[PDB]
Amino acid sequence: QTKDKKLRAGLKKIDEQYKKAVSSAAATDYLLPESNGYLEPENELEKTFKVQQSEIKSSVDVSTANKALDLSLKEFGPYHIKYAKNGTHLLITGRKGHVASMDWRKGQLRAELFLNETCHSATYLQNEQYFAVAQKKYTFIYDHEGTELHRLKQHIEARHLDFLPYHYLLVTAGETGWLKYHDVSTGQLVSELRTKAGPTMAMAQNPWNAVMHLGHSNGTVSLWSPSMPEPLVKLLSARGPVNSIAIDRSGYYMATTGADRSMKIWDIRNFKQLHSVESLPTPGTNVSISDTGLLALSRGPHVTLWKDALKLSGDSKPCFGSMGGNPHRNTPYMSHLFAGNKVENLGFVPFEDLLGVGHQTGITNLIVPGAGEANYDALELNPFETKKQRQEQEVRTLLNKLPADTITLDPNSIGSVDKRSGLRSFLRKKTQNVIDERKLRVQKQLDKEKNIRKRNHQIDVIEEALSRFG
Amino acid sequence: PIEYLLFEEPTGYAVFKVKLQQDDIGSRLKEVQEQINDFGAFTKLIELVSFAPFKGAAEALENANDISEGLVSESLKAILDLNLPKASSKKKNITLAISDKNLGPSIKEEFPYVDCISNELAQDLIRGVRLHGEKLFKGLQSGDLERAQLGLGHAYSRAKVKFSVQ
Amino acid sequence: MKIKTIKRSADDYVPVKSTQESQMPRNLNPELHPFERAREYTKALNATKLERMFAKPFVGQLGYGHRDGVYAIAKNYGSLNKLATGSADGVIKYWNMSTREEFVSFKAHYGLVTGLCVTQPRFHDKKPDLKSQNFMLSCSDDKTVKLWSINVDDYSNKNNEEGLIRTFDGESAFQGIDSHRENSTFATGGAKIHLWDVNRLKPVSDLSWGADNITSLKFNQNETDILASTGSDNSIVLYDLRTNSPTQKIVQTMRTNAICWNPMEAFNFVTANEDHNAYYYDMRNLSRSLNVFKDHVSAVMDVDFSPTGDEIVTGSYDKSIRIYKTNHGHSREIYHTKRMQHVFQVKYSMDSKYIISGSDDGNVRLWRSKAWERSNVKTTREKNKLEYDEKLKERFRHMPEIKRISRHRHVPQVIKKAQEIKNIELSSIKRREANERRTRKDMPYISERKKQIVGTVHKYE
Amino acid sequence: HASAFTRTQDVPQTELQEKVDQVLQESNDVVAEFQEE
Amino acid sequence: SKTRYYLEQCIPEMDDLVEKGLFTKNEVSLIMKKRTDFEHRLNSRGSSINDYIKYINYESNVNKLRAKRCKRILQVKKTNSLSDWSIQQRIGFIYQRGTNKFPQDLKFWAMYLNYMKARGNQTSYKKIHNIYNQLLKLHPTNVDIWISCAKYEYEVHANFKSCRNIFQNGLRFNPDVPKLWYEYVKFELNFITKLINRRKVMGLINALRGDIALTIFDVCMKTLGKHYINKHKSDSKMNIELNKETLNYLFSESLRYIKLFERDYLINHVLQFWKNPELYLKTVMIDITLNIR
């Protein structure tokens, strides 16, 4: 604190205003509508990871038991799963041609597409209405009913596309090693950044920040932003290639899985890797984070869940088996293994507590007691939306879409301050030249004067006898 | 400064308390005229406070005759006496918006602490109240205004003419 | 093995009735609401864009106007409909601004009408009805002052005596007028300012420094015995009426056309001055100006304070109107029309909402003070959204994009060209002064607030 | 601010008022390339 | 929206209530679920006095439960907290909102008054005044309300002058209600007897009285006849018929006054006024019965 009365008053007033604000937020917290769900032993003999999905369905509510889907489509390829950000619509993309978008709760099949072209992945972009899929070659944008709205041509070989929703931006990383931001509202390829690395293996968006984390074959994660053509940052996660990367909802912690049977938990906001699970018997196919800091790993026939692994404690480091039930060891929160499938991917249901896995036969939701965030925020995402509310809110976000170049590494960098005829033509040229030279000469003279000024600021027998002859 | 207004009706007198004042200079503008039409904004400008219903048909008739001639009736005297605050009879009189210039003076000489107003603004307020009519009464029990008007018009006219069974 | 999951009651979220309004749960978790700075910056930028597309100042004019250019305007400080305007024809009118109509229109004088005051006298013969009639006071060039009655429909509380209650013959040609309030005592500046009372036909008191004529007067709003005056030997003279004498004097480099106290500070006034400027002075220390209001391009002609006390409205002999905030020193806003010329009089309205401008093309226009604020009543939701707009753009006022957009205002080509020329001349003066400083030894750093005072009479320290 | 209880004008307004008042008045590898990069 | 305003306004007392050890987090959260349901039901259109009433009833039961909870869990009659008056303040707020939205419902007005009077220990004499002023202004021709206000005032504070003025105003609005006139006379007589009993007690420790009620009767007589003529006011035969009917009505009223009813003197006055056929017979037999008494 500085010894100025006016500045003391100013900073004290501003600080107490901030404190009033946060106290208000805490009161709202007393006012929240619901409560997270959990899973605890009551005892020491039995352990959490010993429970079975049949046991949970028997012991819990019928609405959830109904919600825990299990679809088997044994015809087409392994399926790739995505839930809308709203947490209501589900979109499955088979490996051969099957693409479906379904209301998932009242079981209205919104759209079904049979494509022989080997599709790869997909996402609802801005609502439940428009969704994009990859193909063998191009990227496609589809209406709610399923008609081909657009064939994005420049996004060639687009393995790993994803949509970031405040800026309305579609990111299509693929195989030639290339990353294109396509503004989807106005429809113009915003940016096109080559990656010198190679075929990008995994990809996930930091949402606290809206910066794209790509995971290359070197074993390096690289953080990109659509403004400038060099990676914002690079991290060396694992050796060999990086299979998958997932990012906490606060954009604070990241988990990387690399095909050298390695798994890393990273502190994004300081770039110190919290710790490295090396005891991994088979390479990890997939990793994801819930909304409540709950880590899901998948080794292909196995899915494993670690609660409270995203902290800085040494005890946080996840393990697979504890001798004598040592408390200082982090055993998995909850396990599951399928019969013979290979989990194609997995994603948490946004506002229930379920994680949907896609595997070679199809889709399966596992009931997780504490996965999703129990109490959402209507101003952002309503699982219940009357059509008029949905369209009105769509226009709202369309108005307030953030500019593409606002994406940076620190979402606060907006605020600060700094202080930022013939003879006639010929004779005209001569005289203008003269005026120019005159200006330069005056400048140099002023500079000599100023230099003498700085000098005046900073200030043998025969030579003494003859000082005054020069 | 239009604190109250008075509105006469076939089924009795009403008195409203003005809550906000529409700006006085802008009154000729499309925006404020529209808010007079709309019902949502008129409620913000006016809330009803009192409503004295007439006793019977005869009492209503003679009351309408006295309003026509510009006098104050016993019923009006009572309702004003009840609703209007007693300010100092020298400074800060209470403002009441009426519909009739010629009604002004009688109300004054009965209540020297009140000041009547019949302006462009007060006439606009009267017009809005008349337009919306029953929606403004929050449900207070009133007879069917239209049937009341037919009966009252017929009685008034027969009275002036001296219509006769002979 | 006690377990439970997120179970929702559709009864709780989706209401049983149809009219019942569904509930909106809210969670103020910061990680749930992700972008603060970018989101609020774009809200503020959209807000300024909407401001630019909603700025519609001109709201209308007052009847058919005046024949010969408007030179006197006086708002009624009591009521809110009423102003009084007067024209070089000699014809003075009393306008009802609610209806854009006129109450009366007297042909007052043979020459120009040089001043108007609007008032209510305090007669001792009687008490003229303050409720049925208003009173008005015209100060003419043919050596007369006339007091008129106006029949005003404000109240409906009665049912003759229409015009020219009284006339005060003068010995000189009168040149400005104002009336001390709560006392019914007016003061008129011709060749020597006279303190008149309503009931005496001979000027009650003589106030004059010396033998100079006095262009204009104004009492102040509070501590109401302080009068200030502007004289044609480009002087500004404060008078006090309790001691009954002039008090002090300052002489500037060019004549000050008009002065207005402010109604919230009671010892600050602002003077519209012909060297293109408006100088804002403290009364107790007249050696220096509190602030200088800059952005005109010809003689400033009138100033007025908003009754809230924080904004100033100036009208120049260039054909435009400028609105300033008391703390800045550059124009907030510029009003201009192809049909308005030589703004000679400006009056800011007693609800602080509007501006009246009398211009010598003969017209009394009236404008909105903030070019947005429609007069209708606003639902509470809309009102909150609008106040939120204003707060956000005050916060982000200085970001380059927002500044570019909210400062782009279209100005007539005459003012643009005059402004660039004036900038060229000031640069020239400044750099010749720079070279002279480079050489010479003793030159004072004459401040931008003292540069403009030739000399005061009562020197203090 | 007028109420229904207090006599406001303190002067009778009906025959009842006057009569009662007057009566009461009377009653009172990879690491290596990373390093290089 | 406005519901959000009301809920956040409810938060702090909830904070206090959980803070003191007498309500658990889950219980309080359930309380707020119910609160939000009620708030939306009131705010949304189509609401009704039944919704306001059920909201009040729920809050009252919460208050009772809180009182018994503090009695049991810490054996304190009254915690020096924010809650202990917060709940009743919110109940008052609910009553005000309901009446500003449905000023028609006499039953709701009366629940409001009963609540406020019964809790009258901490309340305002002035607050009862305000409620009654607003109600009377809205429903001037409800002699029930006028009588109720007068009786409350006279029974609680016995402000004889204020009750007198109330009756004066009530008559000034409704000269047509014989019930009102009847009750006014009853109040007059009760006041007279109370004064005379006070005089008797002063005598123990150490007639204009009727004439006031006589005058009230006379003017009631006159104006009631007037207004009965005015309803159903055309020649001599109907003049005589209406005169006869109003005589019948009005003297039945005088008979009611006789039943209401020192006493002999007042009856006597009624009899002379009456004199000023079969009715004459009834009068004279009344005379002989009085002489019997």
Side-chain angles (χ1 to χ4, degrees), chain A residues 28 32 34 37-38 40-42 64 166 249 351-353 373-375 377-380 400 412 446 449, chain C residues 1-8 13-14 24-28 31 33-35 37-39 46 438:
Chain A
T28 295
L32 301 153
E34 281 202 50
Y38 63 86
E40 62 86 19
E42 274 96 336
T64 71
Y166 292 103
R249 189 208 34 191
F351 288 131
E352 289 263 351
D353 51 1
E373 184 177 1
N375 43 32
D377 188 291
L379 294 201
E380 308 287 347
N400 311 141
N412 307 120
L446 264 72
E449 300 210 64
Chain C
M1 172 175 318
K2 55 153 181 153
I3 66 174
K4 54 212 181 303
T5 67
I6 295 90
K7 65 177 72 67
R8 326 266 198 182
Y13 294 150
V14 171
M24 304 276 284
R26 301 217 60 237
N27 202 352
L28 299 187
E31 67 268 18
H33 303 290
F35 287 100
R37 289 265 180 77
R39 271 207 209 175
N46 286 327
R438 192 181 75 184

Side-chain angles (χ1 to χ4, degrees), chain A residues 239-339:
Chain A
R239 295 91 45 79
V242 172
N243 290 318
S244 298
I245 61 172
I247 295 174
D248 182 3
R249 189 208 34 191
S250 172
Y252 203 112
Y253 303 92
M254 182 179 72
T256 66
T257 295
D260 51 336
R261 290 181 325 280
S262 159
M263 178 186 167
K264 311 301 221 78
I265 309 302
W266 275 91
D267 182 328
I268 291 173
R269 282 190 196 168
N270 290 318
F271 309 101
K272 280 78 173 176
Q273 53 164 3
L274 285 190
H275 57 266
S276 48
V277 164
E278 60 85 20
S279 69
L280 202 65
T282 60
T285 63
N286 285 150
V287 162
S288 160
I289 307 292
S290 77
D291 291 331
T292 61
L294 193 142
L295 182 62
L297 168 67
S298 84
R299 294 145 42 151
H302 305 264
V303 167
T304 308
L305 280 299
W306 285 279
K307 189 170 86 46
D308 196 285
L310 279 298
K311 287 175 176 292
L312 272 77
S313 169
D315 290 329
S316 69
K317 168 163 176 287
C319 295
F320 291 84
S322 79
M323 61 79 71
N326 181 26
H328 287 250
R329 196 148 150 85
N330 199 339
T331 192
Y333 178 79
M334 182 179 72
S335 169
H336 188 88
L337 62 84
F338 301 117

Side-chain angles (χ1 to χ4, degrees), chain B residues 101-143:
Chain B
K101 299 188 292 182
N102 309 58
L103 192 53
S106 296
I107 283 177
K108 165 59 74 71
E109 68 89 18
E110 278 288 351
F111 299 94
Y113 52 99
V114 75
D115 279 337
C116 314
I117 291 194
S118 51
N119 264 358
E120 195 259 333
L121 305 168
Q123 287 301 314
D124 284 19
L125 270 194
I126 301 299
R127 178 163 199 282
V129 170
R130 175 195 317 278
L131 190 154
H132 296 134
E134 271 180 80
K135 297 185 152 24
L136 275 192
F137 284 61
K138 301 185 281 168
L140 300 173
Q141 194 41 267
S142 312

Side-chain angles (χ1 to χ4, degrees), chain E residues 45-56:
Chain E
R45 69 182 65 88
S47 66
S48 64
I49 289 308
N50 276 347
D51 291 331
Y52 285 84
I53 279 176
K54 296 179 179 65
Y55 193 16
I56 297 169

Side-chain angles (χ1 to χ4, degrees), chain D residues 2-7 13-17 19-21 23-24 26-27, chain E residues 129 132-133 136-137 149 164-166 168-169 172 181 208-209 212 216 219:
Chain D
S3 79
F5 295 175
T6 62
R7 191 181 277 245
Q13 293 88 21
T14 179
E15 70 280 44
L16 276 296
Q17 265 158 343
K19 280 175 179 186
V20 186
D21 293 8
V23 179
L24 294 174
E26 311 325 316
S27 289
Chain E
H129 281 232
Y132 267 113
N133 276 308
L136 280 180
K137 280 165 191 165
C149 193
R164 191 180 318 279
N165 298 326
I166 295 316
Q168 314 283 79
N169 285 118
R172 185 197 205 172
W181 293 97
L208 282 77
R209 272 68 54 202
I212 56 174
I216 308 304
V219 293

Side-chain angles (χ1 to χ4, degrees), chain B residues 49-51 55 81-82 139-140, chain E residues 104 137-138 140 172-173 176:
Chain B
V49 175
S50 178
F51 178 71
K55 296 300 183 296
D81 195 38
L82 172 65
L140 300 173
Chain E
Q104 216 290 317
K137 280 165 191 165
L138 279 171
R172 185 197 205 172
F173 267 89
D176 295 341

